[PDB]
Design a protein around this ligand. Structure first.
Ligand SMILES: *[C@@H]1O[C@H](CO[C@@H]2O[C@@H](C)[C@@H](O)[C@@H](O)[C@@H]2O)[C@@H](O[C@@H]2O[C@H](CO)[C@@H](O[C@@H]3O[C@H](CO[C@H]4O[C@H](CO)[C@@H](O)[C@H](O)[C@@H]4O)[C@@H](O)[C@H](O[C@H]4O[C@H](CO)[C@@H](O)[C@H](O)[C@@H]4O)[C@@H]3O)[C@H](O)[C@H]2NC(C)=O)[C@H](O[C@@H]2O[C@@H](C)[C@@H](O)[C@@H](O)[C@@H]2O)[C@H]1NC(C)=O
Ligand SMILES: *[C@@H]1O[C@H](CO)[C@@H](O[C@@H]2O[C@H](CO)[C@@H](O)[C@H](O)[C@H]2NC(C)=O)[C@H](O)[C@H]1NC(C)=O
Ligand SMILES: *[C@@H]1O[C@H](CO)[C@@H](O[C@@H]2O[C@H](CO)[C@@H](O)[C@H](O)[C@H]2NC(C)=O)[C@H](O)[C@H]1NC(C)=O
Ligand SMILES: *[C@@H]1O[C@H](CO)[C@@H](O)[C@H](O)[C@H]1NC(C)=O
Lengths: 171, 324
């Protein structure tokens, strides 16, 4: 993927995270678990709803379109009507299949970027209070209980509150 | 030996696949089908109005009143017109129907009409016989004729020059049809019309045509060496149509006061009428869909998805599905 996260340095997805597209797995002394990041999931849902609805809006509505009849001395006109019908059909088939191919490629890159942005957001909160151990995981240099975990998940992690304990463990 | 938080993404058991430019058949967690391929296999009303089923008849037979089409006489309004592969009863006395395809095109925007007696049988032709029939237009085994036309023949050995007119006070367009008989030999000509050099003239304010019989012995068709050509014209509100003949005129008896509509048309269909209502009718069935595309049929009545040749149009909404 273009942004290196999905099927990249985060090798796989989580069947255990059932309630959003992107999120967190935590492990501390109180235990372990999955939580979806509600905000990044919802932003992506807003974007893709709008993308689907754009395709819908741009196609509009096909009004009544029926065959036409020509007598035996109207062959040229018959063939011209058929050339018109076939021509338009070629073009709309082409536009439809291509629009979907190209938008599918962009939709997957979009998710890849969202996951990457989420990772960088956490990394930026934690600074040197945690170690990047790859596969998208951080190893805290301090005890991070459920309340601390939640503060990471919702963007209020208190870096100075734990810097000293972290510096010592990082030695 | 340390607490961890990891960033990750959703996986599930979806087997949905989509195509992309760089890669085909990517399995994704969620997706949405954009291509409608489902129809109810029936003919339906459009906005509560039933279509006009010609059945074994075609437009020609319907509007001339081919006796096989008698069940269509009372029908006055429709949402669309359905011909079938067996729509074979048209002209029953052989001949040419002039500008027939134009006439069908005109009926495609008609949504209802009024069948009315433009030239009543018992009072328009006091000096002519209004009784000609033919075995080519049999009904129930007896020779008969179109329910909307009238064969005028000699009465007591003379075919006096006739001149009748009608004035369109219907306040709508009036479709008028008539016919021109061409006997196969001079004997039949004189026997039916008593004037071997006959002619017919039809004139409105914007229509002007004159007809001359062409008498010759032609290959028999429905057991007739004679011919009958059929003609029509639209009479504008307030305009006057005038017929004038000393022979060979197949006169109008019934005509149609038309009312125009939008989104009608003629289709050919195998399918059976049903007690259903639809916004979108194809010849194969009715579509009930919000999807933007369909590969069901290029011919559509109503408000339909766009026809495409595609077998598959699936848009990914979720992610690459990578269950671990
Ligand atoms: C992804 O997984 C889904 C579920 O996961 C799996 O389900 C089973 C098979 C086990 O392997 C689990 O370990 C695993 O989690 C699949 O959807 C599931 O499909 C099965 C069909 O076999 C379906 O079972 C039916 O359930 C209904 C409703 O009963 C309720 O059950 C749960 C529990 O309360 C509830 O959450 C549901 O919403 C329902 O309210 C039941 O009426 C059915 O019984 C009828 O049919 C059986 C024969 O199958 C017959 O003997 C009965 O007498 C009766 O007529 C039947 O038991 C599961 O409910 C369903 N799971 C969910 C959450 O809906 C999914 O497969 C797809 O499932 C269907 C939705 C359908 O589209 C299938 O064609 C799909 O294969 C799977 N996805 C894929 C792509 O494989
Ligand atoms: C973000 O997470 C923090 C940490 O849990 C939340 O702050 C605490 O929220 C709980 C509510 O269950 C309170 O009991 C604590 O007293 C709060 N601590 C402080 C210092 O306020 C915070 O509310 C969360 N924000 C959102 C929007 O969920
Ligand atoms: C067309 O399909 C839709 C669903 O595929 C049918 O849904 C109905 O929609 C109306 C208005 O949105 C609702 O009030 C009904 O509750 C829906 N029906 C059901 C069973 O939930 C709709 O009726 C279909 N139309 C036809 C003519 O078949
Ligand atoms: C009409 O129906 C038959 C099946 O009864 C089908 O095979 C045939 O293709 C249909 N006609 C057309 C023109 O599609």
């Amino acid at each position: 993927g273009l942004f290196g996260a999905i099927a990249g340095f985060i090798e796989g997805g989580w069947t255990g995270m059932i309630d959003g597209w992107y999120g967190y797995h935590h492990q501390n002394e109180q235990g372990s678990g999955y939580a979806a990041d509600q905000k990044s999931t919802q932003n992506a849902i807003n974007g893709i709803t709008n993308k689907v609805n754009t395709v819908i809006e741009k196609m509009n509505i096909q009004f009544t379109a029926v065959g036409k009849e020509f007598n035996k001395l109207e062959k040229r006109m018959e063939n011209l009507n058929k050339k018109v019908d076939d021509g338009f059909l070629d073009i709309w088939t082409y536009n439809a299949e291509l629009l979907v191919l190209l938008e599918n490629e962009r939709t997957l890159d979009f998710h890849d970027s969202n996951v990457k942005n989420l990772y960088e957001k956490v990394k930026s909160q934690l600074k040197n209070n945690a170690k990047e151990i790859g596969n998208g995981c951080f190893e805290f240099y301090h005890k991070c209980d459920n309340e601390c975990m939640e503060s990471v998940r919702n963007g209020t992690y208190d870096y100075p509150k734990y810097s000293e304990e972290s510096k010592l463990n990082r030695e | 030996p340390g607490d961890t938080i990891c960033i990750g993404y959703h996986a599930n058991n979806s087997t949905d696949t989509v195509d992309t430019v760089l890669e085909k058949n990517v399995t994704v967690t969620h997706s949405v089908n954009l291509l409608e391929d489902s129809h109810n296999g029936k003919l339906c009303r459009l906005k509560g109005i039933a279509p006009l089923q010609l059945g074994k008849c075609n437009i020609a037979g319907w509007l001339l009143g081919n006796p096989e089409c008698d069940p269509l006489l009372p029908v006055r309004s429709w949402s669309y017109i359905v011909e079938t592969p067996n729509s074979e009863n048209g002209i029953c006395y052989p001949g040419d129907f002039i500008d027939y395809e134009e006439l069908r095109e005109q009926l495609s925007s008609v949504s209802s009409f009024e069948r009315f007696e433009i030239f009543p049988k018992e009072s328009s032709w006091p000096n002519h016989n209004t009784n000609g029939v033919t075995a080519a237009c049999s009904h129930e085994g007896k020779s008969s004729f179109y329910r909307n036309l009238l064969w005028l023949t000699e009465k007591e050995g003379s075919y006096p020059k006739l001149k009748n007119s009608y004035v369109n006070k219907k306040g709508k367009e009036v479709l008028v049809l008539w016919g021109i008989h061409h006997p196969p030999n001079s004997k039949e000509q004189q026997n039916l019309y008593q004037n071997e050099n006959a002619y017919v003239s039809v004139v409105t304010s914007n229509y002007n045509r004159r007809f001359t019989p062409e008498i010759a012995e032609r290959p028999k068709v429905r057991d007739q060496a004679g011919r009958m050509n059929y003609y029509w014209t639209l009479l504008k509100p307030g305009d006057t149509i005038i017929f004038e003949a000393n022979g060979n005129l197949i006169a109008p008896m019934y005509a149609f006061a038309l009312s125009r509509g939008f989104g009608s048309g003629i289709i050919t269909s195998n399918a059976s009428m049903h007690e259903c209502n639809t916004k979108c009718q194809t010849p194969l069935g009715a579509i009930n869909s919000s999807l933007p595309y369909q590969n069901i049929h290029p011919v559509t009545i109503g408000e339909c998805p766009k026809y495409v040749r595609s077998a598959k149009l699936r848009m990914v909404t979720g992610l690459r599905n990578i269950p671990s």
